[PDB]
Design a protein around this nucleic acid. Structure first.
Ligand code: MG
Lengths: 106, 82, 97, 95, 95, 106, 97, 87
DNA sequence: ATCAATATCCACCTGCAGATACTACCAAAAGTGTATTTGGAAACTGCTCCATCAAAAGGCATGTTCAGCTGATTCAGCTGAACATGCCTTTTGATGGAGCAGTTTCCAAATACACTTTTGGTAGTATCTGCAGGTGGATATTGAT
DNA sequence: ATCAATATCCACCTGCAGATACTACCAAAAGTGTATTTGGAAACTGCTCCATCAAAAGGCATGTTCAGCTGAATCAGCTGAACATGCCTTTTGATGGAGCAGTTTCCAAATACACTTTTGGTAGTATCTGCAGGTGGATATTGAT
């Protein structure tokens, strides 16, 4: 026996993905590649965020990723921000940002 | 010292939120306005959450009840299940 | 005999709070308000601890972001002081009114 | 008692490939898990809709692909599409 | 010459019921037809999700009911709930 | 020999609504009351809008409801306006509404 | 020699256009614009004429609503003249950025 | 087919007067001269987003013609549902 | 400018909440081999309607003119920021019991299948009618004075 | 106020587009009836984890003081509205084929069912550690002068 994930070179469960698709009433039937494709895509996106959130951890002199690191990762990247633009990350706070007219005069 | 619960959402707490939001100076009338807005928010969300609860024949609002309410309100939340 | 100018502390707090992520409303008052509101929909209700939390997370996110837009509306009108009209304009444009 | 599934370990596997000296809080993992479930639903949801528009009974990778294009922003979509077509190739050829 | 179905005759019946001397333009009917399809899809969707959330495989009139309360606003919901309840009750007793 | 519609006291078509529920893959199974309850709600809403649209037609001395009348109906009713707050009625126009400050003198 | 004061025809037009429902952009120009943009995504495409109409109905509806919101932004600023900054504030608050 | 006319600068068919009419329907009394370019931009973005999705549907269906339904489905994804054209 | 009050910075230390590690475990997916059912590309062709040409209906571009709006300047006064801490509300932690969630049961209701009937669509050719768009004719609105 | 230029509102009419009509027909419906499968309510019950509350923590309500913001008043410069004017571009109505969409055959592919192997969630007990929270002292920032 050899997992469909390992066949597809993926850390993400092709099996589970396949199942979840059937028991989702998304359609009558489900081709064999769809879960592979789908699972890749999820893996991919997970990596991207984990990368940037790690980098965010690094910047703040940390090795354990927390919510704040996911928030800084997501809202400092134009594309992730847009994909997650109607999502709230619990315990993420906000990007430091102050409108310039609110700064004291030089 | 009899008092409405909405008023528990105090001036300093509201002031802090504003601050997180980048606000420097705040009209005194904001505090009542903000409470009004918060009350409408919670109504809309809670109404929907409870409706989920009643459907599941439960007496406890679960975090998933809230999460699902937020999702259909267009306010998807991450970190409490689902 | 040493006093800070109006808005120095305001700026200081902006920086502080933009940096943190704690919830900024006290847990209990909020919990009551939630329960009170739920009572008009169904009586004898109980709440998971995480359910109240989720509601708080969401409300504070909601309100923080509305203050951003609000602040933009005050600035649009060449002010630095948020007023109820600025909240109203923001809610109207967002399609909440 | 009932087994509560999660993407957490797969997330964790991927974390290590990407940052082998970096860890992750519970709360952070929960968020990642929501994320995966969300995107899952969004993509499947769109794919469903596509099949239906086109009077088809099946969700094939073509549907997931078009779904991804429609949901993901420009560059993200491109990479995801390549990672997706990749994984399917690799899987077919493997015995 | 494939058969394209709509809710038009039903909309017309109901129209006659409420305004017996009033007609409806075909564009107006088109919009009416869109509106019914839309609300159907939106109720059926909420119903769908609701079942799933409660690990149910069946969509009953109880699911539709909650979907309605979730989807519609105050007074429309109150009255739509009457009319559906009424119709089911009257459906059960009619055999 | 009786339809379920007449059985339920409905103009809207229960058979049809049953059929469309199955093929839309909303769940494995569809209960017998669902298409009844839904067809009723559908009929209720379409009645409510036609009533109001009819009045707009009559308020304009017209006999045939057109899209402008649908729009006047929906947008003049708080609850239909919200239910359709993110929907556009082709050929409906907008509600007459000029903001105060724009009018002449003081 | 005769003249309306500035603003008088403008209000006349508001009443006129708010009363009707015809499309306000000329058909053909808008058609070309569609075809151009599409071509830039994909060549050798055809359009059902109702598809162009659907786009036009959507586009005009979108733009008319944007101008109400825009107008409200000017008025918030104690002006009666819409400017690009008003459009921009509307679109930011709307979440179009 | 022989020859195929080149499309360019069509954004300028969205004339000043047509934009003024839409403002009017939108209740606008006074219009700064810079509005027209800005509006052309905004419209161009709006169309690109809708047409991309519409055409994506077209291609997924393996068609060369963009249907009213492709546009209607695109409009729905983008939270701008349209009634009157088959959806 | 200088001077000083206070906020902010960095380094180092430390206990433990919250992370990773672990093995049993077992149960429940996921994968493997066999037989069944079904979907949708390819091949073909009717035929809708899209692209592409010429004539008629009216909206667009452009320059001129000046009304009145915007945005700068100034300024008085009102209103929100900053401030000190005892005081009262929230937080932390300790403990019964509601209820949620796990499990098993059994039946009312749902799926399946197979004639049997009804109906909702279209198509062909006809037949009717609401109203849009023309006219002229009587009353409102607007702006000069 | 008065006059008058211009828009607006009726009312009445008339062709004809587009709507209501109807008779033929039919394929795909919905309906009816009988056979077989099972989902979920229903009922008992075990154990979280939720409400309650006492004790310990600590954030906020208070009123006073005044810096500095908001908004009213004023004004010049100039942008944008109105309009007259010349005519280019769109709109409207009538003729060729690319491609859509409807039928059918056929296998490559997904379903199903049952079986056999492993993986992933939990719990058990313990195992481990990153860092929040505290210290100290050096330096920056702000505000008074
Ligand atoms: Mg081009």
């Amino acid at each position: 026996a050899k997992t469909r994930s390992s066949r597809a070179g993926l850390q993400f469960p092709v099996g589970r993905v396949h199942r979840l698709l059937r028991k989702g009433n998304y359609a009558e039937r489900v081709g064999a590649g769809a879960p592979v494709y789908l699972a890749a895509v999820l893996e991919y996106l997970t990596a991207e965020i984990l990368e940037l959130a790690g980098n965010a951890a690094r910047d703040n002199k940390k090795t354990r990723i927390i919510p704040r690191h996911l928030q800084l990762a997501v809202r400092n990247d134009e594309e992730l921000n847009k994909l997650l633009g109607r999502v709230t990350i619990a315990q993420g706070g906000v990007l430091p940002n102050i409108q310039s007219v609110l700064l004291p005069k030089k | 010292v009899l008092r409405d619960n909405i008023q528990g959402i105090t001036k300093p707490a509201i002031r802090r939120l504003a601050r997180r939001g980048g606000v420097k100076r705040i009209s005194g009338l904001i505090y009542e306005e903000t409470r009004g807005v918060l009350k409408v928010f919670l109504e809309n969300v809670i109404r929907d959450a409870v409706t989920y609860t009643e459907h599941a024949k439960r007496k406890t609002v679960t975090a998933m009840d809230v999460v699902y309410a937020l999702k259909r309100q267009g306010r998807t939340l991450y970190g409490f299940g689902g | 005999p040493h006093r800070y100018r109006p808005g120095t502390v305001a700026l200081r707090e902006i920086r502080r709070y933009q940096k943190s992520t704690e919830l900024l409303i006290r847990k209990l008052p909020f919990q009551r308000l939630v329960r009170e509101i739920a009572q008009d929909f169904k009586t004898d209700l109980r709440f998971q601890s995480s359910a109240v939390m989720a509601l708080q997370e969401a409300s504070e996110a909601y309100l923080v972001a509305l203050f951003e837009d609000t602040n933009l509306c005050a600035i649009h009108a060449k002010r630095v002081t948020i007023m109820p009209k600025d909240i109203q304009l923001a809610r109207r444009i967002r399609g909440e009114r | 008692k009932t087994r509560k599934e999660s993407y957490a370990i797969y997330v964790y596997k991927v974390l290590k490939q990407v940052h082998p000296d970096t860890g992750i809080s519970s709360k952070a993992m929960s968020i990642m898990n929501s994320f995966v479930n969300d995107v899952f639903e969004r993509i499947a949801g769109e794919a469903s809709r596509l099949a239906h528009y086109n009077k088809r009974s099946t969700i094939t990778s073509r549907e997931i692909q078009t779904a991804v294009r429609l949901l993901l922003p420009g560059e993200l979509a491109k990479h995801a599409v390549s990672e997706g077509t990749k994984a399917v190739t690799k899987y077919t050829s493997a015995k």
